[PDB]
Design a protein around this ligand. Sequence first.
Ligand code: NAG
Ligand code: NAG
Ligand code: NAG
Ligand code: NAG
Ligand code: NAG
Ligand code: NAG
Ligand code: NAG
Ligand code: NAG
Ligand code: NAG
Ligand code: NAG
Ligand code: NAG
Lengths: 211, 413, 419, 149
Amino acid sequence: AYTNSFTRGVYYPDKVFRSSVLHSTQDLFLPFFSNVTWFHAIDNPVLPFNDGVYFASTEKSNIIRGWIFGTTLDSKTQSLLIVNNATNVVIKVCEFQFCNDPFLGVNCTFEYVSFKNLREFVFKNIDGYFKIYSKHTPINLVRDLPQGFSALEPLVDLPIGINITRFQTLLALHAAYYVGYLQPRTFLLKYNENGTITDAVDCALDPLSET
Amino acid sequence: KCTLKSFTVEKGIYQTSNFRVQPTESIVRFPNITNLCPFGEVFNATRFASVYAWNRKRISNCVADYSVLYNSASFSTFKCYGVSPTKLNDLCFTNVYADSFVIRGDEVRQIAPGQTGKIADYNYKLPDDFTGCVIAWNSNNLDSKVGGNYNYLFRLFRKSNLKPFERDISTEIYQAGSTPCNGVEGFNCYFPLQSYGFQPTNGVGYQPYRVVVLSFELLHAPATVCGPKKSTNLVKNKCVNFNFNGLTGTGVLTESNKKFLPFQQFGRDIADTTDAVRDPQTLEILDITPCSFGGVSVITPGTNTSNQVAVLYQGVNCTEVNVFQTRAGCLIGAEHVNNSYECDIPIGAGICASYQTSQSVIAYTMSLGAENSVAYSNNSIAIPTNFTISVTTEILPVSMTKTSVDCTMYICG
Amino acid sequence: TMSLGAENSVAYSNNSIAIPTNFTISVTTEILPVSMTKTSVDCTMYICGDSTECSNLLLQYGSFCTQLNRALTGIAVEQDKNTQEVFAQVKQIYKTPPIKDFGGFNFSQILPDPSKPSKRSFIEDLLFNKVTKFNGLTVLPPLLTDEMIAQYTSALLAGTITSGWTFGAGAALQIPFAMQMAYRFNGIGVTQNVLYENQKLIANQFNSAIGKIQDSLSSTASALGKLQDVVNQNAQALNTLVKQLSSNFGAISSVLNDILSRLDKVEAEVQIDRLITGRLQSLQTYVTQQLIRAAEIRASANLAATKMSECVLGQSKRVDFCGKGYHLMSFPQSAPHGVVFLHVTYVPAQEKNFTTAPAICHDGKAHFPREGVFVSNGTHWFVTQRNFYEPQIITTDNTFVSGNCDVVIGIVNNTVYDP
Amino acid sequence: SALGKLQDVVNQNAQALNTLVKQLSSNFGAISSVLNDILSRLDKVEAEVQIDRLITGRLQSLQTYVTQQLIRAAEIRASANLAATKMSECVLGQSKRVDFCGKGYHLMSFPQSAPHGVVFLHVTYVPAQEKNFTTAPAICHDGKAHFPR
Ligand SMILES: *[C@@H]1O[C@H](CO)[C@@H](O)[C@H](O)[C@H]1NC(C)=O
Ligand SMILES: *[C@@H]1O[C@H](CO)[C@@H](O)[C@H](O)[C@H]1NC(C)=O
Ligand SMILES: *[C@@H]1O[C@H](CO)[C@@H](O)[C@H](O)[C@H]1NC(C)=O
Ligand SMILES: *[C@@H]1O[C@H](CO)[C@@H](O)[C@H](O)[C@H]1NC(C)=O
Ligand SMILES: *[C@@H]1O[C@H](CO)[C@@H](O)[C@H](O)[C@H]1NC(C)=O
Ligand SMILES: *[C@@H]1O[C@H](CO)[C@@H](O)[C@H](O)[C@H]1NC(C)=O
Ligand SMILES: *[C@@H]1O[C@H](CO)[C@@H](O)[C@H](O)[C@H]1NC(C)=O
Ligand SMILES: *[C@@H]1O[C@H](CO)[C@@H](O)[C@H](O)[C@H]1NC(C)=O
Ligand SMILES: *[C@@H]1O[C@H](CO)[C@@H](O)[C@H](O)[C@H]1NC(C)=O
Ligand SMILES: *[C@@H]1O[C@H](CO)[C@@H](O)[C@H](O)[C@H]1NC(C)=O
Ligand SMILES: *[C@@H]1O[C@H](CO)[C@@H](O)[C@H](O)[C@H]1NC(C)=O
């Protein structure tokens, strides 16, 4: 299944404050109105990672709780694993030997700890530095990812140096979710009076956006 | 007189070199972390890494002293890129990646940015734009052994050259032709690694050398590896020189309502200079405003008539420099007057100055002319009963001197 | 494909004339730039930002920095000269009497309003609403404040209303405003009885045309485009000069304090000379384009000063110099960085066709009109003033003789009256 | 000071040539501002590095001069076009244009030559001694309204 991404998937590009300004930047962004893959966990196959990922899920029930990343997923290299279970965060990179059908059951060079709603996330891995961004919002639409704009703040950067070409998501076992890929687009970002990114233009979308 | 390169000065207003408020104190701020950085875990380990499989050590959340390294007689080379070693103790970085390995004494030439050859292309690749230091020492007494120290390995072959910092540890057979290798050595099919096998009989070029490449994560992100420098109390509402985490500048600091989100560390201007900071010891946002500056104009009657003078600090406030405030700036040595006259020397915003009685420079709002109610009514006319013939002069420039310049004789003579 | 205009066969023949039987008083706005913002740049602080290390390298380049400050000082002094040459054309600050008995013409919307915090007219306040510093860059104030510019437009306007053109040639001489307007009608070749016989209509047409200026300015934000374009070009030039401080020009960083906090002197100088080279070229490109832009504003101020003299202090015979139609009069209003002229013109309105002749035969003598055209309603022949239909009996006193009927091509037989 | 517009054109052109000659003494980052000093001290490979810093800066110095002389020539041309118009309209004619040829009602003008310029002596009639009168737009007679010619 597929859906329109609309203007979703913008994030704060750098750790610098700006306000009441229009600012132009080139980075891995999800293009406006791009084509997003869609799944229903009541459905967690392995997917390619490309240059980076936008991920989102619908919420009323806490089914979806984590992710796996790597190249072969079979102990031949360090594989990033993330859990965020709605009370705790746990992160690991060991040479795990996952089975062909893993779930969260209801060498480790790094380790770390810390529908009514839509949860949004962005993952990117430039030179194996795994950066993460996210957002949450209430929603009115039961079926699908609604049209709107709200930028994602950074959460974490992992200095792990890991090559990723494949990834997967983890269900809790004894909901609608989404995947789309980032591209090296130029964007014009609007920073408001309170320094929030409140709107953007994808400069390659159409000739008016290029104008 | 020096600005005009003349001993006589005509009547007028002349700009002379600019005024700047000077920094009153120097302010220094760094994170209050106390850990000494773990560099001994790299430089003084008994074991060391093979160059085909170099070890990266993360350095973070600590106080360094890089001068302990470059003061030492121990190092056979100490190159630095994007930084000078002498200056590292004043800086602070988000992380250091200390990459570490053994190579032969000749191969130090391949441990540099943008290089080629067996070590650079098949073992350890530095980028075109590296920021860091490459530190090497002869380790014959640590890493040679009789019969050969075979514990140190290098990749002899690869099917394509590595990207910068691409840590390929694969032992899969190198294929030199169309011949299938079946995971074993054979015709056109070779193991990709070799061993240095170091012996104490080896010469200065074929001896083992230990290498550390300190690579600096230098970013807008918060810093965690700082040099050994002190930090001061903070200062506000005063022009000061300042340093936050190595970000050196000068200005008036104040508290501010700039609503930094918890991940932001600096604010930037249209010139990409910094216009706010977050302090590394308290989560408080400081606005930065430039120390006051302006042109300085000297207002003079001609030296043919007086040596008295008045001075205008353009756009400055008189609290920052008779003394009088105007929209043009702070005006000093001019007597303010409530009479109004033709504009003799122009100051700006309707203010002018002249030399008058007590013979001194005076400053006043200019008069546009005498004020005249014309005697209009619906039945009154004025008719001229006599005339005067005026002859008035007008002067117009028509040409200028016809210069020529042989640019080959101007440039090269 | 664009259309140039509606096609029109003019109804020409060798004996047909069209004479206008009525007129309209137009008031039309002209907007001219007169000055631009007086910027100044401390080129040492722009290029080197109070680094002493960069400051000593910038001395290797000699007098490039003082001649940039000399060029911008010449541009800045010229903006006050441009303003003085347009507005300071009065020698005295004239004022209107407290009784506005101008024969029914109503100047209240262009004369000063004392309720305002600066004494601008109502139309000068609309003009001031419809048009909109850290890196060694500064803005210097103009010599004449907007309050002083509004006193000059007030004096020019009050001299023109109370005394006509006389205050331009010498002392202001009072003349009743309808008698001054009767002179303006003689100046376009309309006989002055046409004003006195139509005075109440001409005043209503003028007062209505000033009401249309208020409505246009109180709605049409594109109207002052020439002044906003001059404001916009100077802002875009400064934003370009400031953003060029963020460029590397091939140095390791554009921030001069990165180089001076990361590198020792011998390696820092190699990086700083790239910043000096690119920033010096950035500032030379700005000053060169501000010199070319200043020359264009000076040409517009020289035109605005010539329109003040020839259109406000006089009445102009020059076609289309003081608006479209025959010029009667003009009024100046102040605007941000410029001047607005309200040009008052006579436009002919309602043609009728007539038969016409070059001359008339009477007693075999050829008679020609002294100051008019010979015209016919189809049966009778009349002499008319040339710019307004007012037919008079053909007489020895509105005609003159020369020779006899044998010579003139198209002469007509009609009686000429002897009083 | 009455001749100031012509002296200002002399002074600006003199100051531009003195600025252009002073810029020969600048190093632009070379070891010396003297070209024979570089060539008598250094061998060809190292001398050409120093000479190209002088060539770069002296070429920029001369481009700056010729650019501001082009901009100044356009101002002198505008003034000469105006002077040629005042010659035709006020020496060869009698102008009706207000304040084009002096204040007052223009009678006549005389050209006088001056260094790099022209001086016009403009002769004008100025009305000088007013008297006030009552006035009327028209006069009644036998019910006829009369207006002055
Ligand atoms: C996404 O791609 C599929 C084909 O892969 C196409 O049918 C669908 O219409 C596309 N949707 C959008 C939003 O472009
Ligand atoms: C989240 O994980 C922790 C262990 O990391 C566990 O103790 C906790 O109960 C989990 N919470 C939920 C809501 O599953
Ligand atoms: C750790 O590395 C060794 C080889 O050095 C490997 O055999 C082992 O499987 C790795 N650990 C895990 C958790 O796979
Ligand atoms: C900015 O934040 C303030 C509260 O700090 C709020 O009142 C205001 O409405 C916000 N403005 C915008 C444009 O979001
Ligand atoms: C040290 O810094 C932290 C914030 O980083 C702050 O909470 C603490 O009060 C500081 N203590 C001192 C003595 O500076
Ligand atoms: C110079 O000053 C003297 C008196 O000291 C005076 O006679 C002369 O006229 C002055 N000239 C000028 C040009 O000011
Ligand atoms: C000058 O500074 C004082 C504070 O010392 C302030 O009250 C005043 O408004 C300032 N005036 C100007 C024109 O800056
Ligand atoms: C000018 O007049 C004002 C009152 O109008 C007065 O306050 C001020 O002190 C006077 N200045 C001088 C220099 O006398
Ligand atoms: C004048 O006469 C011609 C006769 O053909 C006619 O076409 C034209 O419309 C007339 N114009 C006016 C203004 O009466
Ligand atoms: C106009 O032309 C006609 C012929 O079409 C001729 O008979 C007549 O005399 C001419 N009239 C005038 C006034 O030229
Ligand atoms: C004309 O009359 C007015 C009446 O107020 C008077 O002020 C003015 O001085 C008179 N002018 C002459 C020249 O008589």
